[PDB]
């Protein structure tokens, strides 16, 4: 579990979005595993605007933050998980590291701020849904 809170937006894994998220929907994209809902309070997070490939992610199944190198966001084939079938996912970054389904929502951060959230795992990789292209998260 986990979310990004930027302005009056809440950014979550689409597959973990609540009824309250869907009832206050700003934007969602199944191909990216992302959903953004509206919030009443303002959030503590800054979105990175950059092409960093090094950062640190939170792994709930280890209660640890790990430094990683990661690929630039791309269209990747993901094997079946407890929450999705085998499929192609867009805007996905991969790193070598530990990820279980419940790790989804952990933040990946760089020197510039929040890069994305854990979205995929298995076979010694962790996948992160990028948010750095969502420039609209910082206005309106
Ligand atoms: Zn950066």
mmCIF file of C-alpha atoms and ligand atoms in Angstrom:
data_model
loop_
_atom_site.group_PDB
_atom_site.id
_atom_site.type_symbol
_atom_site.label_atom_id
_atom_site.label_comp_id
_atom_site.label_asym_id
_atom_site.label_seq_id
_atom_site.Cartn_x
_atom_site.Cartn_y
_atom_site.Cartn_z
ATOM 1 C CA UNK A 1 0.000 0.000 0.000
ATOM 2 C CA UNK A 2 0.977 3.668 -0.293
ATOM 3 C CA UNK A 3 0.221 6.916 -2.102
ATOM 4 C CA UNK A 4 1.713 10.218 -3.284
ATOM 5 C CA UNK A 5 0.072 13.395 -1.971
ATOM 6 C CA UNK A 6 0.799 16.403 -4.240
ATOM 7 C CA UNK A 7 -1.358 19.527 -3.884
ATOM 8 C CA UNK A 8 -4.996 18.342 -3.814
ATOM 9 C CA UNK A 9 -4.163 15.036 -5.606
ATOM 10 C CA UNK A 10 -3.756 11.524 -4.251
ATOM 11 C CA UNK A 11 -1.785 9.194 -6.587
ATOM 12 C CA UNK A 12 -2.328 5.471 -5.977
ATOM 13 C CA UNK A 13 -1.925 2.192 -7.804
ATOM 14 C CA UNK A 14 -5.117 1.839 -9.897
ATOM 15 C CA UNK A 15 -5.573 -1.761 -8.631
ATOM 16 C CA UNK A 16 -5.566 -0.500 -4.975
ATOM 17 C CA UNK A 17 -7.850 2.523 -5.530
ATOM 18 C CA UNK A 18 -10.785 2.692 -3.067
ATOM 19 C CA UNK A 19 -14.464 3.471 -3.783
ATOM 20 C CA UNK A 20 -13.737 6.976 -2.381
ATOM 21 C CA UNK A 21 -10.889 7.327 -4.952
ATOM 22 C CA UNK A 22 -13.198 6.313 -7.858
ATOM 23 C CA UNK A 23 -15.976 8.619 -6.523
ATOM 24 C CA UNK A 24 -13.506 11.573 -6.545
ATOM 25 C CA UNK A 25 -11.686 10.566 -9.751
ATOM 26 C CA UNK A 26 -9.300 13.027 -11.513
ATOM 27 C CA UNK A 27 -7.578 10.626 -13.946
ATOM 28 C CA UNK A 28 -6.884 6.913 -14.305
ATOM 29 C CA UNK A 29 -4.902 4.827 -16.757
ATOM 30 C CA UNK A 30 -5.078 1.007 -16.580
ATOM 31 C CA UNK A 31 -2.023 0.602 -18.893
ATOM 32 C CA UNK A 32 0.067 2.548 -16.261
ATOM 33 C CA UNK A 33 -1.585 1.061 -13.092
ATOM 34 C CA UNK A 34 -2.243 4.664 -11.925
ATOM 35 C CA UNK A 35 -5.249 6.479 -10.523
ATOM 36 C CA UNK A 36 -5.401 10.050 -9.221
ATOM 37 C CA UNK A 37 -8.229 11.247 -6.955
ATOM 38 C CA UNK A 38 -8.961 14.695 -5.425
ATOM 39 C CA UNK A 39 -8.121 15.503 -1.740
ATOM 40 C CA UNK A 40 -9.513 18.144 0.695
ATOM 41 C CA UNK A 41 -6.106 18.673 2.458
ATOM 42 C CA UNK A 42 -2.744 19.565 0.743
ATOM 43 C CA UNK A 43 0.017 16.898 0.521
ATOM 44 C CA UNK A 44 3.710 16.866 1.686
ATOM 45 C CA UNK A 45 5.242 15.416 -1.584
ATOM 46 C CA UNK A 46 7.175 17.120 -4.463
ATOM 47 C CA UNK A 47 7.249 15.376 -7.870
ATOM 48 C CA UNK A 48 10.686 14.989 -9.457
ATOM 49 C CA UNK A 49 11.042 16.649 -12.900
ATOM 50 C CA UNK A 50 14.103 14.922 -14.290
ATOM 51 C CA UNK A 51 15.501 11.808 -16.052
ATOM 52 C CA UNK A 52 17.337 10.444 -12.985
ATOM 53 C CA UNK A 53 18.071 6.680 -13.115
ATOM 54 C CA UNK A 54 19.269 6.428 -9.506
ATOM 55 C CA UNK A 55 17.167 6.790 -6.364
ATOM 56 C CA UNK A 56 15.863 5.068 -3.246
ATOM 57 C CA UNK A 57 12.615 3.083 -2.830
ATOM 58 C CA UNK A 58 10.607 1.943 0.153
ATOM 59 C CA UNK A 59 10.061 -1.818 0.457
ATOM 60 C CA UNK A 60 7.275 -2.536 3.026
ATOM 61 C CA UNK A 61 7.976 -6.308 3.000
ATOM 62 C CA UNK A 62 11.496 -5.494 4.373
ATOM 63 C CA UNK A 63 10.617 -2.287 6.307
ATOM 64 C CA UNK A 64 13.660 -0.812 4.484
ATOM 65 C CA UNK A 65 14.574 1.835 1.947
ATOM 66 C CA UNK A 66 17.005 0.556 -0.745
ATOM 67 C CA UNK A 67 19.193 2.560 -3.132
ATOM 68 C CA UNK A 68 18.673 1.396 -6.747
ATOM 69 C CA UNK A 69 19.507 2.148 -10.339
ATOM 70 C CA UNK A 70 16.433 1.917 -12.594
ATOM 71 C CA UNK A 71 15.539 1.934 -16.275
ATOM 72 C CA UNK A 72 13.796 4.902 -17.986
ATOM 73 C CA UNK A 73 10.003 4.527 -18.235
ATOM 74 C CA UNK A 74 8.967 2.183 -21.089
ATOM 75 C CA UNK A 75 6.339 -0.335 -22.331
ATOM 76 C CA UNK A 76 7.267 -3.645 -20.577
ATOM 77 C CA UNK A 77 5.755 -7.172 -20.488
ATOM 78 C CA UNK A 78 4.865 -8.091 -16.857
ATOM 79 C CA UNK A 79 4.223 -11.740 -15.786
ATOM 80 C CA UNK A 80 0.974 -12.501 -13.890
ATOM 81 C CA UNK A 81 0.678 -11.203 -10.295
ATOM 82 C CA UNK A 82 -1.943 -11.776 -7.556
ATOM 83 C CA UNK A 83 -3.637 -8.499 -8.857
ATOM 84 C CA UNK A 84 -3.051 -8.480 -12.676
ATOM 85 C CA UNK A 85 -2.727 -11.069 -15.476
ATOM 86 C CA UNK A 86 0.437 -11.376 -17.622
ATOM 87 C CA UNK A 87 0.242 -8.109 -19.685
ATOM 88 C CA UNK A 88 2.048 -5.053 -21.091
ATOM 89 C CA UNK A 89 2.326 -2.038 -18.712
ATOM 90 C CA UNK A 90 3.387 1.451 -19.953
ATOM 91 C CA UNK A 91 5.531 4.139 -18.215
ATOM 92 C CA UNK A 92 7.203 1.359 -16.141
ATOM 93 C CA UNK A 93 10.767 1.508 -14.716
ATOM 94 C CA UNK A 94 12.638 -1.612 -13.517
ATOM 95 C CA UNK A 95 15.309 -2.051 -10.871
ATOM 96 C CA UNK A 96 16.985 -5.069 -9.264
ATOM 97 C CA UNK A 97 15.419 -5.504 -5.859
ATOM 98 C CA UNK A 98 12.772 -7.144 -3.739
ATOM 99 C CA UNK A 99 9.028 -6.483 -4.364
ATOM 100 C CA UNK A 100 5.915 -8.424 -3.259
ATOM 101 C CA UNK A 101 2.341 -7.438 -4.226
ATOM 102 C CA UNK A 102 1.768 -5.604 -0.931
ATOM 103 C CA UNK A 103 4.850 -3.418 -1.621
ATOM 104 C CA UNK A 104 2.810 -1.584 -4.279
ATOM 105 C CA UNK A 105 2.566 2.122 -3.426
ATOM 106 C CA UNK A 106 6.053 2.417 -1.907
ATOM 107 C CA UNK A 107 7.767 5.606 -3.113
ATOM 108 C CA UNK A 108 10.806 5.740 -5.383
ATOM 109 C CA UNK A 109 12.601 9.096 -4.856
ATOM 110 C CA UNK A 110 15.590 10.845 -6.400
ATOM 111 C CA UNK A 111 17.458 14.019 -5.539
ATOM 112 C CA UNK A 112 14.577 15.999 -7.176
ATOM 113 C CA UNK A 113 11.652 14.365 -5.265
ATOM 114 C CA UNK A 114 9.156 11.556 -5.918
ATOM 115 C CA UNK A 115 9.773 9.576 -9.142
ATOM 116 C CA UNK A 116 7.019 6.950 -8.876
ATOM 117 C CA UNK A 117 5.484 4.119 -6.873
ATOM 118 C CA UNK A 118 6.068 0.390 -6.731
ATOM 119 C CA UNK A 119 3.711 -1.323 -9.209
ATOM 120 C CA UNK A 120 5.313 -4.748 -10.183
ATOM 121 C CA UNK A 121 7.622 -7.370 -8.648
ATOM 122 C CA UNK A 122 8.968 -10.918 -8.975
ATOM 123 C CA UNK A 123 12.134 -12.641 -10.233
ATOM 124 C CA UNK A 124 14.396 -10.221 -8.358
ATOM 125 C CA UNK A 125 13.079 -7.045 -10.053
ATOM 126 C CA UNK A 126 10.895 -4.218 -8.750
ATOM 127 C CA UNK A 127 8.846 -2.159 -11.180
ATOM 128 C CA UNK A 128 7.787 1.452 -10.568
ATOM 129 C CA UNK A 129 5.002 3.423 -12.237
ATOM 130 C CA UNK A 130 6.563 6.739 -13.261
ATOM 131 C CA UNK A 131 4.765 10.008 -12.416
ATOM 132 C CA UNK A 132 7.433 12.513 -13.531
ATOM 133 C CA UNK A 133 5.712 13.118 -16.913
ATOM 134 C CA UNK A 134 2.420 14.142 -15.148
ATOM 135 C CA UNK A 135 3.190 17.857 -15.137
ATOM 136 C CA UNK A 136 -0.476 18.705 -14.361
ATOM 137 C CA UNK A 137 -0.007 17.181 -10.857
ATOM 138 C CA UNK A 138 1.631 20.591 -9.950
ATOM 139 C CA UNK A 139 -1.156 23.022 -11.101
ATOM 140 C CA UNK A 140 -4.957 23.714 -10.825
HETATM 141 ZN ZN1 LIG B 1 15.771 13.255 -10.284
#
